């Protein structure tokens with residue numbers, strides 16, 4: 338909760354930068370050591386930087402680009418939400434996915450929890 | 463959870479239509495009889511259609527316009543999130559607010575919970 342609303346926007350916007358360039362290790366470092374990731378929201382949670390790193394590597398190493406599609410909405414309790422689009426190549430087929438992540442940051446300015454909202458109704462070829 | 467992902471997008475997009483025209487009674491009817499609203503997220507929850515109606519009337523009757531700024535992100539468990547902008551007139555001063563609502567729908571296709579993410583860093587004159 339330590340991050341102010343402006344710090345949240347900055348942090349979350351940097352995250353999207355990292356996913357865009359694919360700096361997996363830099364992304365894992367933004368998360369708390371024991372953070373949880375629910376992506377897509379509804380699935381079972383992923384816990385810990387090791388698992389998170391595996392998750393991101395499995396999804397980024399290949400091909401994948403991402404960018405904010407609107408400003409970052411931030412609350413005053415270290416929480417935030419942002420809209421963005423991901424463009425990837427699915428086994429030859431060019432694809433895009435519109436997503437919204439809700440993140441809760443801890444007192445050290447690290448991501449404690451992340452939830453990504455999307456399903457195939459958000460996929461587009 | 464009854465609503466499919468496509469039904470979620472439709473429902474949430476209709477909600478924004480209702481806020482745009484200001485049909486308060488129609489908006490209250492989209493919510494479950496005992497739904498809770500947290501707006502801005504972080505504040506104490508509002509419970510029940512009576513309180514919800516008061517909330518919406520206090521905020522809409524005046525002046526206020528709203529519209530989706532991106533597609534609706536929907537999961538498969540009756541949950542959804544959408545980005546939108548609200549344009550209002552603050553005591554003479556024209557203003558806009560970028561928001562993201564996360565909604566959970568119940569088995570009857572009604573909104574059980576709504577959380578709006580935003581703060582003054584999202585306000586713009």
Ligand SMILES: C[C@]12CCc3c(ccc4cc(O)ccc34)[C@@H]1CCC2=O
Nearest residue numbers: 356376396401423425434436438453
């Ligand atoms: C893995 C993936 C690329 C990146 C990505 C996806 C879904 C949600 C995400 C949420 C994030 O916060 C960062 C990256 C992704 C896609 C699912 C299908 C795909 O190719």
Ligand SMILES: C[C@]12CCc3c(ccc4cc(O)ccc34)[C@@H]1CCC2=O
Nearest residue numbers: 481501521526548550559561563578
């Ligand atoms: C009340 C309000 C107009 C409508 C509105 C606001 C904030 C969050 C919202 C979330 C909604 O899902 C629907 C409408 C609003 C503004 C706060 C300042 C203002 O003028």
